[PDB]
Amino acid sequence: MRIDTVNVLLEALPYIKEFYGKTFVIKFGGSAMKQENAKKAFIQDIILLKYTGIKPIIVHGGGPAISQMMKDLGIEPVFKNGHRVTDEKTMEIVEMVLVGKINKEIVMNLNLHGGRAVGICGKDSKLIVAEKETKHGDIGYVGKVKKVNPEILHALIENDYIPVIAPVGIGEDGHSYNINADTAAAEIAKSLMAEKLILLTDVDGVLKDGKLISTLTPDEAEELIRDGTVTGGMIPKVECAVSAVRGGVGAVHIINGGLEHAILLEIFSRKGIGTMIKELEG
Amino acid sequence: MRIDTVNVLLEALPYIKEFYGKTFVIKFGGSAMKQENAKKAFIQDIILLKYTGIKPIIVHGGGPAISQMMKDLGIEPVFKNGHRVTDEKTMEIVEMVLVGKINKEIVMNLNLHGGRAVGICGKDSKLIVAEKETKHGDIGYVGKVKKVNPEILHALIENDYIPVIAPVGIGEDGHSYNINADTAAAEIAKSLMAEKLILLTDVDGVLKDGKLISTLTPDEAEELIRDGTVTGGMIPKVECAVSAVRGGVGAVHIINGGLEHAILLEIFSRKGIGTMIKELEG
Amino acid sequence: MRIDTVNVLLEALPYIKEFYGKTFVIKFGGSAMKQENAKKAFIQDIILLKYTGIKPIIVHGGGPAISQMMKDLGIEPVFKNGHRVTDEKTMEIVEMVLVGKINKEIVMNLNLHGGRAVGICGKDSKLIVAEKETKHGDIGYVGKVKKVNPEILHALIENDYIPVIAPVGIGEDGHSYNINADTAAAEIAKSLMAEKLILLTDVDGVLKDGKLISTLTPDEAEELIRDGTVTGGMIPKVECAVSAVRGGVGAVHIINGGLEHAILLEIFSRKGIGTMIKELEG
Amino acid sequence: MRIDTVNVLLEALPYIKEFYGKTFVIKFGGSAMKQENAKKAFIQDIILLKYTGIKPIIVHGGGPAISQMMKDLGIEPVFKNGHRVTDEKTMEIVEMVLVGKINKEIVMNLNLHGGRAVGICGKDSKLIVAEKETKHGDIGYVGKVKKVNPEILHALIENDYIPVIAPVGIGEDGHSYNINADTAAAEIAKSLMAEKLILLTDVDGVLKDGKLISTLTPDEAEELIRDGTVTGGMIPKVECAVSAVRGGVGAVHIINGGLEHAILLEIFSRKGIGTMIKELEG
Amino acid sequence: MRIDTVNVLLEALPYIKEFYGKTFVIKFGGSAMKQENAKKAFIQDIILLKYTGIKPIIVHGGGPAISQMMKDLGIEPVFKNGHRVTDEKTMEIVEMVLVGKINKEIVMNLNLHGGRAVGICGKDSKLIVAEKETKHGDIGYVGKVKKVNPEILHALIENDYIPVIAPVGIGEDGHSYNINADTAAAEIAKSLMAEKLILLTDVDGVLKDGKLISTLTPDEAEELIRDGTVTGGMIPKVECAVSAVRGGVGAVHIINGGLEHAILLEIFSRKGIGTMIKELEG
Amino acid sequence: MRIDTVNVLLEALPYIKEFYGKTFVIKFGGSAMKQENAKKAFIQDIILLKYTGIKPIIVHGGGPAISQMMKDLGIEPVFKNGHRVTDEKTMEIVEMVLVGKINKEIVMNLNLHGGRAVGICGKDSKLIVAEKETKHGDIGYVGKVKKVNPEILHALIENDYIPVIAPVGIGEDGHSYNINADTAAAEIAKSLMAEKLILLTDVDGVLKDGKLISTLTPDEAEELIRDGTVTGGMIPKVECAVSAVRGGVGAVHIINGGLEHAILLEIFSRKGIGTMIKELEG
Numbered sequence A, B, C, D, E, F: 001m002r003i004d005t006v007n008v009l010l011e012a013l014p015y016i017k018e019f020y021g022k023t024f025v026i027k028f029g030g031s032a033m034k035q036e037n038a039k040k041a042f043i044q045d046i047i048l049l050k051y052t053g054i055k056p057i058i059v060h061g062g063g064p065a066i067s068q069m070m071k072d073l074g075i076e077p078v079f080k081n082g083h084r085v086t087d088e089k090t091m092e093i094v095e096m097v098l099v100g101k102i103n104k105e106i107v108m109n110l111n112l113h114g115g116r117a118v119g120i121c122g123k124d125s126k127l128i129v130a131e132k133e134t135k136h137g138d139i140g141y142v143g144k145v146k147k148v149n150p151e152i153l154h155a156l157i158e159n160d161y162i163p164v165i166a167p168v169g170i171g172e173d174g175h176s177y178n179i180n181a182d183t184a185a186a187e188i189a190k191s192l193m194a195e196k197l198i199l200l201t202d203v204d205g206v207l208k209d210g211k212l213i214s215t216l217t218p219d220e221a222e223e224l225i226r227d228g229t230v231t232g233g234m235i236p237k238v239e240c241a242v243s244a245v246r247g248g249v250g251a252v253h254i255i256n257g258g259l260e261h262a263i264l265l266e267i268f269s270r271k272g273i274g275t276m277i278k279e280l281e282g
């Protein structure tokens, strides 16, 4: 009863003072979109951050929808190898599913509870200018971010709108490219000198094995990739968080999307429920 | 030859003065979107409107792109008789082709010439609130406009952005509805009391016994649907035109979208090249 | 653990949205200044309301300090009866203790935790214009509020300062008058169309005997004074709350000052911990 | 023809974009001030410049009206030698025709076609601070420019007014000095860092053996005054042009004041109708 | 003496408070324009009015300089009858002395003592729109005032400039009309709803049999023109005074242009040195 | 007599111009607060400064009022030798007489004449942060200024309020300290880099062999404390004056507070009536 209330609020409220007016870039990866209750709490968390004066910016990935469409549209995966190739027709379907399907569902859910969210993509006012990714050879319209023009995002958050961004970039050649969501969300936070970058994943956070490491610095994060503690798909995430932070972002939080109110618990408590990467005061 | 340059300018410059800062809602139909040459001159015209200080707003349709998706997807039409029926799955493909492909091609083009266009749709910040169009029975997720919330538009145009709108509204329930681009375009123009509403068709304008009618008062226009001179799809148009004019829109122009620079010739010349409907005045 | 956090925050946060930017007038009566821990929590509550965007305004009464000074200064209570008389020399000592002693201690405590509080009184920019109270005959410089000039309060809260007001008013004759704190705090909230008026007392709130009545309307409050449920010193308080509310104040909360974080618990929970008086929506 | 309208506009509209808000200083010479149809066109071009968002500033000359005023006043054009002379009696008359007669003739016309013109001279607010001319002994009160105070001009054009300026300078001793309009116009231009200075002469411009010279640069222009292409009174002008260009002015234009609508053709077409002097930088 | 300073200031400083930011229109008549020491004082008072925060506007007359210009130009003051006449030739000369000579003499002086003066006439921005005078047959181009457009004046005084206005009116036909300075000054006053109109005459003001009249009201003043106290040319002036007062002007002042520092003494002392006409309202 | 009125105004008006919008920190001592007649003329002067557009700030002392409270309270002095000692209880009575009585009498007076005064003290929003003055040993809660936080002052004067400051600062610990009004007044003036710092004393100014010294540069002033010409309490003053001037204060004036209208005579006359210390200049 009562005391739980006092202590939660005394722990929380301060954070309302510090984050009021700041920008949080939140990456909707896989997980937090699977189980229904986790999906509901998430939508709710965003609305709360908005009630407290925070400017949330959402970034989402692809998923089931894309593989399905490709099949239902009788199209097979093409490879050069380092991976799958993305030919014109495939890019058109990806952009169609991401923008016309996933992006707008999130916008509907949010606008169903007061979020005033408007969906857009890298093409809009050239938010994300991209270029051909060539490390594995010409494998299609796979891109790397060349520049971020955040004016549109400032115009939106400045008028109380929550951007919902689909990872599709525009190249000078006018063509469109697919972009890794984590990277796009990180590049978008760097260009805004955003307070936080929140990456939702399928785990509690970085585990120094059997245990969750609550805090880390960019240097301590890399060291764990070098000494082999960090492996799998978790490597590219942490590597993304390290870059974001060294690029001007206040802090990056890696947390479990399958955890109900993971976002609410990570931001309004002092201990959190995931891993936070950040430079020391110094 | 000098003589020409002088005459065209003495006649255009005055319009640049009176239209500065004004808003023009333009409905982009099928013809001007079909021939690369009318389409190239169209983008060119929006850009010139922007350079003269006019605030354009674009609302586009769909057509071929949608049907093709239907066929490539094995989705079979359904009747609940009165006509076609936008069902659950049909809507999703419509929303996906309008938002994810058509909308973004227009945004790309404009942004390839300094238009600073951002493409949204009826769902974003609930710009277009719709409810199931019940007159022709239960034909599915076909809707009529309950209300237009123009805030996002104002935010975008005041910040020098060109909104490219997809005709898909949202219902209080939360389901997306397909709306007639002409009505949509006419409704938002009313909501903003725009200076002009421009409808690009495939015909020169409103014809009577093979003769283009230059001018029309709303009344004269009702007596042409009444008189039987206006028929077929042109009825819904003239209908929107009259509604728009009485609702506060300065004037609506029904011109031939297949005519190169139709917009330029209609706006910056005294006689015009199509039909303009407006009240009497001094 | 956890869930307590989620439910407290989900119950609280909404209120941050509604009260942000609003003004709360808080009356520091007797009680909440007695036991030390209650005094500490109170100071803390004010700072929190400030962290959340609320504009608190404090009003305090007299107490032990005044009786003491009168004795230490060898002065005896004079009566005409309806009460104690307030002769020039007595008024001078009251104003000295209230302004020079009580008022500034509160300011120090607050400014010890970030409150940016500045103490002032009814004399300042003629905040409280008063006049001779004559219902019991000329008994000295006892006053009734004749007018409130809240400009000074707007200048302060508008610049992030928390006013701490001592109940001393100025009369046109230039002389100063003592004013009942509850009345002054109520008159000050009315003149500001303040969202809330919070009266701290020595009880849980209005008790329909053995039980605490959580909510009431101005009419239901008076009825309880007529039917004799409300008696004692609690009559003038409720009567004060009724007036304030009928004068334009969002709502008045009567709560226990001896209760730790009474303010925090009353404003960030839906049930509260005292009595709230307010007109119905209608 | 519809192709003339398209072409003329596709050329002009872009200049409209880049000249919007800029300032043009224009020297109203003797030529265009003569033939009723050359004069009509000029007053019109000035207005159209205003309609497109440009801020025009006009500097006029004298000559005829003055000479006739000397002689009518029983005074014969006095000399001493180096040219004429402007003794105290001759000056006062000069200032009377330039400011009292001519300057008002120009304002009276513009203001019959919505010009919002207000005439002033170098004395008003000490716009043009001049010093007794020395390079030619003591030729009366003829003077040179020592300082320009555009404050008044700025104030005027920011309020949608068109400054019609008379070449009379004011000296530190309150005294008046006659000044060369072209050089006054060129000095005020530099003083504003205007976008353009237009000098209207009695001939197409700089003729390279009959053949007219379209564009040049400061360094080139001086070379034609050296080899002897620029002869006669076309030398004085070409220099101001240079002076101003190096003084910060965007570009200078020497056109046929006689050529009806010379201004219009020179500014909104890419080839102009006269000689343009400017620096190199695409 | 120290008591003189105290008294003079305790009187003046209050007027400084209430005249701060207000507008005063002042008619520079023939009197104060004559004796080098009367003239010196005037230019000084105007500056001091500016130093205290008042916005002065000056309207000058002509007379002498003109008459000498008629005759020097071989033209004798023509008549027909009802008084003089101002045929086309006579007007142009008039406009030349009022605007070209006189108006600049006043600006040249103020601007030697930090006045920031800029001279203009009724033509500039169509300040004074006049109609051919009719009450006296056809006496040339003498005219009456039909409309004032203070826009220019406002623009000027808001930028810390002092308008020096010449009485020449501009008619709907672009033509020029001579106008009575006093009435021009009174019309512009009403047009601005100025705080004061100062008419400088050739005598202390309105003399009630030698004895000077301090204050009056509109209704009273007219009565002295009826019984015959106000005789001679002191009738025309007194009327403008009335006209303006009823026209909205705060008050009017008729003082001795001859009296050195008349303005200063009349405005900062409670008794004034001349006759003041105004409405009743403490 | 006219002759006087003119001379006083030609000499005062110029000062009204240069002091408009400037800030004057005035230290109100014992003399001007002792005689009802100097005190009446003092309030009158602050009001006139306000009416001329100057932003006065008042810092007052104490003296008699405090001692009397001491005696009427049976509080006995204490020495920790070097001099008197402000102990726990002594401070509380000092704070109570300065804040609760003296401060409020000045606020009342001013507000009785339109001064819109609000009285604060060093504690309010930590305007004056002090630490125990350790030079003369441990004499109690006597303090020296560690820092001045002028925000509240800026808020008050920008909103047309006259701050009446009590010389009681606050220490980081939280204990209140007694500070020298002269230093306090000199410190805040430095913090605001006020135009003037005015010290009202009981002597005409800085004297040398019975002669008042009109002007002084900081250097000339140090050589008078050094030379032995300045003695006693005047040392701390001249000391503050020099410090203030070098710290950014435009000039400090040391005048006789017992002289009626000392402030008026010093500010609005060229010669002044006391001593003005300022750097050399042009």
Ligand SMILES: CC(=O)N[C@@H](CCC(=O)O)C(=O)O
Residues within 6 Å of the ligand: A028, A029, A030, A031, A060, A061, A062, A063, A180, A181, A182, A183
């Ligand atoms: C991997 C990454 O950057 N993004 C995810 C987002 C979708 C998800 O988590 O399922 C992706 O697959 O592209």
Ligand SMILES: CC(=O)N[C@@H](CCC(=O)O)C(=O)O
Residues within 6 Å of the ligand: B028, B029, B030, B031, B060, B061, B062, B063, B064, B180, B181, B182, B183
């Ligand atoms: C029908 C109508 O109102 N609009 C068209 C626009 C598409 C086009 O021109 O191809 C539509 O299909 O919705």
Ligand SMILES: CC(=O)N[C@@H](CCC(=O)O)C(=O)O
Residues within 6 Å of the ligand: C028, C029, C030, C031, C060, C061, C062, C063, C180, C181, C182, C183
């Ligand atoms: C009664 C009331 O209005 N105020 C209280 C405030 C002090 C307190 O509660 O002790 C008072 O005694 O004047």
Ligand SMILES: CC(=O)N[C@@H](CCC(=O)O)C(=O)O
Residues within 6 Å of the ligand: D028, D029, D030, D031, D060, D061, D062, D063, D064, D167, D179, D180, D181, D182
């Ligand atoms: C002052 C001056 O040089 N004036 C020139 C203006 C006309 C011109 O150059 O064509 C003049 O004829 O008197």
Ligand SMILES: CC(=O)N[C@@H](CCC(=O)O)C(=O)O
Residues within 6 Å of the ligand: E028, E029, E030, E031, E060, E061, E062, E063, E064, E167, E179, E180, E181, E182
């Ligand atoms: C135009 C006009 O009436 N002028 C007057 C101005 C001087 C005056 O009235 O003293 C004139 O003498 O010509």
Ligand SMILES: CC(=O)N[C@@H](CCC(=O)O)C(=O)O
Residues within 6 Å of the ligand: F028, F029, F030, F031, F060, F061, F062, F063, F064, F180, F181, F182, F183
């Ligand atoms: C001493 C000094 O600096 N100030 C005086 C001011 C009081 C007065 O003039 O009576 C003081 O006692 O603190």
Ligand SMILES: NC(=[NH2+])NCCC[C@H](N)C(=O)O
Residues within 6 Å of the ligand: A015, A214, A215, A266, A267, A268, A269, A270, A271, A272, A273, A274, A275, A276
């Ligand atoms: N995993 C962690 N270390 N979490 C700490 C979170 C701290 C705080 N709520 C923030 O948002 O910064």
Ligand SMILES: NC(=[NH2+])NCCC[C@H](N)C(=O)O
Residues within 6 Å of the ligand: B015, B214, B215, B253, B266, B267, B268, B269, B270, B271, B272, B273, B274, B275, B276
């Ligand atoms: N169809 C017409 N008759 N059009 C007339 C066009 C008038 C003007 N150019 C305009 O855009 O308003």
Ligand SMILES: NC(=[NH2+])NCCC[C@H](N)C(=O)O
Residues within 6 Å of the ligand: C015, C214, C215, C266, C267, C268, C269, C270, C271, C272, C273, C274, C275, C276
């Ligand atoms: N006693 C009560 N009824 N309390 C309800 C409080 C509700 C809410 N927290 C408010 O501040 O309005």
Ligand SMILES: NC(=[NH2+])NCCC[C@H](N)C(=O)O
Residues within 6 Å of the ligand: D015, D214, D215, D266, D267, D268, D269, D270, D271, D272, D273, D274, D275, D276
């Ligand atoms: N003579 C010329 N070079 N004319 C070209 C001028 C082109 C265009 N009017 C401009 O101001 O830039």
Ligand SMILES: NC(=[NH2+])NCCC[C@H](N)C(=O)O
Residues within 6 Å of the ligand: E015, E214, E215, E266, E267, E268, E269, E270, E271, E272, E273, E274, E275, E276
């Ligand atoms: N003749 C007079 N009545 N003069 C009184 C003028 C007083 C003061 N100068 C004012 O403008 O109000």
Ligand SMILES: NC(=[NH2+])NCCC[C@H](N)C(=O)O
Residues within 6 Å of the ligand: F015, F214, F215, F253, F266, F267, F268, F269, F270, F271, F272, F273, F274, F275, F276
């Ligand atoms: N003591 C002096 N000599 N004072 C000169 C005063 C100068 C001017 N009046 C001022 O206030 O700055």
Ligand SMILES: [K+]
Residues within 6 Å of the ligand: B050, B160
């Ligand atoms: K633009």
Ligand SMILES: [K+]
Residues within 6 Å of the ligand: F050, F160
């Ligand atoms: K004021």
